[PDB]
Amino acid sequence: MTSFTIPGLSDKKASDVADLLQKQLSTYNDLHLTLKHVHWNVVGPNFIGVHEMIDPQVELVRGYADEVAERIATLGKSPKGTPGAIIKDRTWDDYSVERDTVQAHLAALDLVYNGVIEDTRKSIEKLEDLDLVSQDLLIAHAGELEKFQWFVRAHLESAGGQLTHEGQSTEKGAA
Amino acid sequence: MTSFTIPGLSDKKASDVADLLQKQLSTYNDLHLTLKHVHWNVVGPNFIGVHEMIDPQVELVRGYADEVAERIATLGKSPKGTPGAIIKDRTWDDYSVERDTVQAHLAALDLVYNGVIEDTRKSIEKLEDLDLVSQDLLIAHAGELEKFQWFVRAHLESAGGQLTHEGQSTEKGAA
Amino acid sequence: MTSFTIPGLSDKKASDVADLLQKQLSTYNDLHLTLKHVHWNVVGPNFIGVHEMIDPQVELVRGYADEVAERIATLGKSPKGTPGAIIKDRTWDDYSVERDTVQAHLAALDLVYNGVIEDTRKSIEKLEDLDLVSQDLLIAHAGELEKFQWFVRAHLESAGGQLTHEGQSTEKGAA
Amino acid sequence: MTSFTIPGLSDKKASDVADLLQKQLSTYNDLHLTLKHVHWNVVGPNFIGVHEMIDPQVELVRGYADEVAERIATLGKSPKGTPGAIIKDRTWDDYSVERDTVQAHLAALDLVYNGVIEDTRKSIEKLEDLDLVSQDLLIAHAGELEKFQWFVRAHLESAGGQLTHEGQSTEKGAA
Amino acid sequence: MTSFTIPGLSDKKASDVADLLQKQLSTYNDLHLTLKHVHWNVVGPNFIGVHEMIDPQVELVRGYADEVAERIATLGKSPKGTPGAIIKDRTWDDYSVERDTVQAHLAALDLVYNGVIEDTRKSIEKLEDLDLVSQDLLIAHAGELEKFQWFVRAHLESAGGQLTHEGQSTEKGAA
Amino acid sequence: MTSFTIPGLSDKKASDVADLLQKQLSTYNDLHLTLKHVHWNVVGPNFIGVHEMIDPQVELVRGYADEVAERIATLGKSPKGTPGAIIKDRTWDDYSVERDTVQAHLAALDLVYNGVIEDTRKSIEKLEDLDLVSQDLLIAHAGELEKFQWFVRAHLESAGGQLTHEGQSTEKGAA
Amino acid sequence: MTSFTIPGLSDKKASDVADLLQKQLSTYNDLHLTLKHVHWNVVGPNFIGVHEMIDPQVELVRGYADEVAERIATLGKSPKGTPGAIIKDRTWDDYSVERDTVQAHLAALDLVYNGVIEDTRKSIEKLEDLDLVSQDLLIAHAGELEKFQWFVRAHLESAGGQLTHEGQSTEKGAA
Amino acid sequence: MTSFTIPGLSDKKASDVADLLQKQLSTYNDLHLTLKHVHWNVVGPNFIGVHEMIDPQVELVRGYADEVAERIATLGKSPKGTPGAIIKDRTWDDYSVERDTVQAHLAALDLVYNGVIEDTRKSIEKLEDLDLVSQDLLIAHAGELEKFQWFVRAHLESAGGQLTHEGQSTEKGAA
Amino acid sequence: MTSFTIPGLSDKKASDVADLLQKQLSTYNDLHLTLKHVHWNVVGPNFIGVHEMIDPQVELVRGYADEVAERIATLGKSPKGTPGAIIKDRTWDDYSVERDTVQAHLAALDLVYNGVIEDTRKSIEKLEDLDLVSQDLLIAHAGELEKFQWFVRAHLESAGGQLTHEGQSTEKGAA
Amino acid sequence: MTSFTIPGLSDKKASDVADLLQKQLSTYNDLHLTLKHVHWNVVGPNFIGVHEMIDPQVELVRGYADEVAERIATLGKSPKGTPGAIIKDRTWDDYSVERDTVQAHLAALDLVYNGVIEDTRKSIEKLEDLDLVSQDLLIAHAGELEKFQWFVRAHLESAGGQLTHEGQSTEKGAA
Amino acid sequence: MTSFTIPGLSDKKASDVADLLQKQLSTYNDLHLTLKHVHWNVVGPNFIGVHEMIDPQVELVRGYADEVAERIATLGKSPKGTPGAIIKDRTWDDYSVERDTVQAHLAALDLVYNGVIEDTRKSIEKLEDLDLVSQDLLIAHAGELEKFQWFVRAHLESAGGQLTHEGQSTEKGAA
């Protein structure tokens, strides 16, 4: 049973890209479940616009999870997508907010995205010497992830300055 | 802050339907992640047909999770969809198979579906005296869930008799 | 070769639902062939409207036959759909009208539908204690079957009263 | 002119289902006109999201009115849909709000829906012994009606508790 | 609270166009309900063609009601669309026909359209000096309204001459 | 200026196919104008069904005219499609019926089609030795032309026998 | 057999609009046949772009002919669309060009359009006192007719000045 | 190089319509750029609904600019659409707001629309004696422009009265 | 391993049709590659129209290659589609033109088509006694192939006569 | 009011990418207006093909302007899109050609594109050390921009050599 | 005849990218013909799934060939796509398998893909210093090419290990 991988790629690197994506795979799965969670637990006068704004993102992220997963399998390894594998690779805490105003959930998500976008950014740099294709993959995602954050922030942005519920990891904005 | 619910429904029952669906909500979320997991980890000569056969089901189940969740929220409670809430309400073990033949994964899934279809069946009967609408909801699902199992089984069915990897909870069919 | 069935269903009932649907399966197959038959053998000034009115129904019924059939297979049994199995389970006489006015064919069909709708109605009641899902299945059909009859009747309806070619099993309306 | 009805249904029950739906028919017609009325008479910063949120519902309800009406006609009776028949069967008061904030109109609608959902709920129970199909019909509606209310409420919901403009029949919430 | 209106329009005229449309708004609402009413209460050999011919018109008119209504709101006033406002602005009698032949209902509708088309024609002339845009609006409608009448008439037209159930306000044609 | 034609075709035959199609081209142009003419000048209780039944045919024939025309041009000659060229190649009389019942117009058209279908049939046989492709072209048309006639006839067909307004060239059926 | 017309229109004017449109009806029919004629008889290096540019126009004009025709019928009269009625109402000469360069045909068409656009312009002014709706109808057309001419001219336009094959009724431009 | 224009239009008027539209052309171009500008520079809790509400308008206006431009070219003149031609024909000041709340931008836009709708209104009246078609063109636009303003205003409208940031040219509403 | 073929066809003929199509298969493959080649290597003022005109043809031919190939396989033999099999069955020279004016490439293609259309024409006649279905297949193609040539020629056609770069196998037209 | 930016990006670089894109934003806006300008001011025998060839590009560029703009906003800054901001950031001269042959406008555009493609190329290199995502963004554009230029050039290309109106900044090609 | 190229690219590099792509162009053309070849020559129980799995890939590759080709032309050179140019640039042997099991063909293709993916990988690295855009182009392809291989391999993969018909260039797997 000769283990395989992409033509012109060292098993060393293959396993290196494989591990990076697998961590990414779980970030996404956690995220499209979370996103969906805040989708149902939002309340406020601007309920509908944010309620609907989230769905396309959930759809988009689910695809990313799928893209990234099959890339691992193409790399030669086996992708892990059961609830356990998520909690396992997961390095942060399970989304804590529940029924609550849009303003709250948004502020919470903003932070969540800070986590995702910062790690992806890193993986892109790391991947550069490992596999340009897998790097291209994440670059594509990054742009869409970063754009969605701005939609969230723009909702919290200050009159002409910026963000409310300012840099306070894990809540901190009743204003 | 007066708690609400459906017009013509006793808070007693509301909370009763709410709890039933919340358990259902997690079964689905676990299932559409699992389904997706076996989607990427299948191998064999009949790889493509099963690879693709699974996707519509994943799409369908994700919707069910969504339907059921908003029903809870309409009931007055708050739906839980983060990875933790899954493992919490979850009463069985995280899908165990990984890269492996279609035949294996199918046999594994069959069993998984046995779990889901049997609990839904129960909830339907229970719900009958609680809320006909929520019961109708699950009835709809049940039919599609039951139908998908048959697709899986039909792949394991015997010449003219029935199922291979016969009633052996957690694997037991190298034939 | 261990025979299978739906999780949480007694082989006793499974075979009971199975038989009911199989009789239904043949009623449909007979019906979408008949419907199609009258579709080609109609004449009159209102030819086109009835000619086209029938097609959607033929399409709809064919699907019902398909739904019901796979339900049997999901139940564990084997569905029968060859011309013989039809004549076998069939308990009435093969549509007798041929080239003839819309008014005639409609009156003939009305009666045919009386047969189908009355038996389905029965099976629904019977199924109630056997399998709620299979019952739901037929309920869905029933509504569409009953609605189509009204389209047919509305064509025979009296000025403000009702039906022409009044209750006369097997023709009886040259008016 | 022999009066007709559904095969396997007692004229007694037919006329019983017929009357129930006819009352339902007018509730809908009143509702999709009202819904449309508040659609044009809304103002506020969250104008657009609610403006558009209402349309699908108006479209959906209009269909329900249509479904229910043809069911009556299939039952053998004659459906009434002119403005007079509405006011006649109508048992409550004509929507009273006019140009006004979303928050107001929503609170007003919430109450309106309380009326509709409570009566439909009743008719479902009543219909159970009369005609399962007609009951299935309304069950379907109910779920969509109940879901739309939640969209409205979610806009009035409290931080983590519930509804503003709390239980005050006919206005009572400037907060 | 400074009342507004269209740039370059005298509040005098604004309120003048506003009133004209509001009367139009109710004519439409009455009409798309009526149209729908005759849609369900038709019988005859040519049932289906007329049954279906009506729907597009109902859809079209509902839109007109919507167009006209938002024009009022754009004018600065508040549009009225509840069942009461209809009966209020309404100057004629609630459609009187019920279950009955196509020929009858058509003849009845013809007359109804005579009412609508004659008043719209008038409003167009009146509006000419008030607001060309609002006039353009109704002109558009008029053409479609007038065209639909011809479909109705063409059904009643004489061999090569014209209309049956000739000029007899409120029925008068058993031929 | 070397005249061209299809590779492997004798200029003798080319000009022979060319002439046949050019006569066909005018038959079509005359026909899709006529068809359209009777489309606007029909009256009766079954007005709508026949009104609409004609349009697809007009669309279809217009295409045939287009197909046939470019075939001529591909043959090397120049197709003629102005009103004059029609009257020129035309060998029969300009459709004579005007505003009149469906029954009349249909009977008139039936005859018109008898003309078209009989000449096309001939051209097919003639073309067989000239150019199989051009023959295939007309065969295709023929089937659709012949089918449309049956729609027309089926409207005039006798109880179980056949056609009314029986073989009477240029009218002859007030029954 | 009481002759009919549009509600609120004097038979005097009806017959006046009727005649104007009937002349228009033939102009269109002549035009969409002609347009089609030049569509097949064009040659040159820019063959394809003009070949295809013409089709949408033919489709558009055919519709105009249809619109205008049913307007006549709605007016109470009977529209004439057979090849004879064309030549009859026709006041100019049958398109004379045959196989020939785009440049030629375009120049020829330009002139043809000059005829159509100038007469329509007139009818619009005339109609103003007769029927605003029928006037609106032609105004709509005019814009599309005028726009298509510009496409044709733009092909003949001078470096920065204007039109080639300058004002020379019936050919006159080998340059 | 003989200058051209629309058949039946005096070069005097042509150049008159031409100039009017050219000013309109620049108003639009300025507007769909501005609209787009505020589309990106909005912030607030109701960010998404207004963010998206603007796009259809930008798309619509861009088309208007296109329609109007080709009308000029059809008139015989040459349309100007480069950034310079805008600033040139432009008679007001370049949109001044930048990153800022929806409420602000809306109030700013309202005023902008007041400018556009008032000038278009004028041009319509002026054009009436010049070219009915070009007048029809702008009438069409006007209705859509006026309607969009109402969407903007409805967001600023008072409880039951009207507009906030009341008549204060160039800002004046922190409330 | 019993060799198969179409029911009711002599292995003698099967192998005869098989060989004919296989030669056709390579002609197509060569052609849709060539067509594509000239698609990229065209230059001139009429570049775009011809650039795009070619694509549909490439798409169409590729399908023909596919149709024809599976027909061989259905015949019992094995279709050959690798670059070698092309050059093998190929009896002419590899397209020689490269970057060059439309006029050139067209003239070159014209000749290429002369080759294809003449051989197909032959195969049709030959096939007539072998297999009517396979003959029908090629007849269909032929018509589309012949039509495309005319598009090419029409670009080279003379003022009113015909083709430029007249009958000069392998170039010969700088005019 | 804490200023924000992308997670894992130094405010130093953010403002650096921001400025680069803002210059790009104006290049695009200038370009899709210009492109549109030449779209209306083209004349010649190949008018239509180039007229239409331009539209997709205008649509594409407008999107790029939108993409790039929201990227700035996501970066933390504020995008500028009013006519003034264009002229401001603009470093070249406003498109100078007006009504004129395709050949001219194309040659003019070619040069315009030389400007855009050369600056984008630069920004890509510069961005490489600043933000890979924003670099990816422009790379995507570049390919489409570069491809469109080739369409333009291919129209000016020499027999087998290259470009006409050879390297002559600001016109220089009457040939 | 001044030779051209992309703005901001040295003719040195242009010709360097040009040559790389031209080799790529032929690899693709060879591949989408081959792919298609194995598409028709497959047999087995899993025939259909692989039969259909291949088509999307053939469609995708054909596009790549098209993309890459126009990139060359945009670079200034001339793309070569005739069967000869393929065999010329081709450095390996023409696909050797013919009618044969899926398992065989897949194993054969796997190897073919090893060739393509390894060379593309190389060209990407090489191109990095030549033209980032052309590099981006191939990166995109690579990902899709690599993904398709995995579909092929997954069919040959071992129970939990990997690939059958293990590393044996040119067949070697009857197991």
Ligand SMILES: [Fe+3]
């Ligand atoms: Fe997915």
Ligand SMILES: [Fe+3]
């Ligand atoms: Fe997938």
Ligand SMILES: [Fe+3]
């Ligand atoms: Fe979902």
Ligand SMILES: [Fe+3]
């Ligand atoms: Fe949802």
Ligand SMILES: [Fe+3]
């Ligand atoms: Fe089916």
Ligand SMILES: [Fe+3]
């Ligand atoms: Fe099926």
Ligand SMILES: [Fe+3]
């Ligand atoms: Fe409806």
Ligand SMILES: [Fe+3]
């Ligand atoms: Fe209906």
Ligand SMILES: [Fe+3]
């Ligand atoms: Fe509507």
Ligand SMILES: [Fe+3]
């Ligand atoms: Fe609306």
Ligand SMILES: [Fe+3]
């Ligand atoms: Fe056509």
Ligand SMILES: [Fe+3]
């Ligand atoms: Fe054509």
Ligand SMILES: [Fe+3]
């Ligand atoms: Fe038409």
Ligand SMILES: [Fe+3]
């Ligand atoms: Fe029509």
Ligand SMILES: [Fe+3]
């Ligand atoms: Fe546009």
Ligand SMILES: [Fe+3]
């Ligand atoms: Fe345009």
